[PDB]
């Protein structure tokens, strides 16, 4: 069977950064909209709109794009409010260094939860995939999912 959300986390404030040259900005927007919708119907509080529009960046510029986009989003919010989630679109082929850098920067420098999604899955946007990503986001932000065993 499928896991379900018992307790849904809250994603009030989120942003997206794209690192794939196969993905145009409006596709990143659509993907995030569909993901937000799936998180919501699965049981989360999830803002349908991001703090800032999605941006595309070169993998080489990972530290600069992350820090700049984080500062711009948190400055826009003010009030000591935090970014609850960064959605990252990754290229299909060797994301190794990029992925490691992303997680290091988000975990240890920015202190933000990130969820990475591969390009091929972004194009397909299958219900199964979106539901699976939603379950992952939920537990990362402090929600609770069922177990099957």
Curated annotation (Swiss-Prot):
Subcellular location: Cytoplasm
Description of the deletion phenotype: Narrow rosette leaves. Single shoot bearing a terminal inflorescence. Abnormal inflorescence with infertile flowers and filamentous organs.
Tissue expression pattern: Widely expressed at low levels.
Transmembrane segments: none
Family indicated by similarity: Belongs to the argonaute family. Ago subfamily.
Function (record text): Involved in RNA-mediated post-transcriptional gene silencing (PTGS). Main component of the RNA-induced silencing complex (RISC) that binds to a short guide RNA such as microRNA (miRNA) or small interfering RNA (siRNA). RISC uses the mature miRNA or siRNA as a guide for slicer-directed cleavage of homologous mRNAs to repress gene expression. Requires DRB1 for directional loading of the small RNA duplex (guide stand and passenger strand) onto RISC for passenger strand degradation.
Subunit relationships: Interacts with turnip yellows virus (TuYV) protein P0 (via F-box-like domain); this interaction targets AGO1 for degradation, and thereby suppresses its function in silencing. Interacts with turnip crinkle virus (TCV) capsid protein P38 (via GW motifs); these interactions inhibit RNA silencing ability of AGO1. Interacts (via PAZ domain) with cucumber mosaic virus (CMV) protein 2b; these interactions inhibit AGO1 function in RNA silencing. Interacts with SDE3. Interacts with HESO1. Interacts with URT1. Interacts with RICE1 and RICE2 that act as cofactors.
UniProt name for this protein: Protein argonaute 1
Gene that specifies this protein: AGO1
Full protein: residues contained: 592 to 739 of 1048
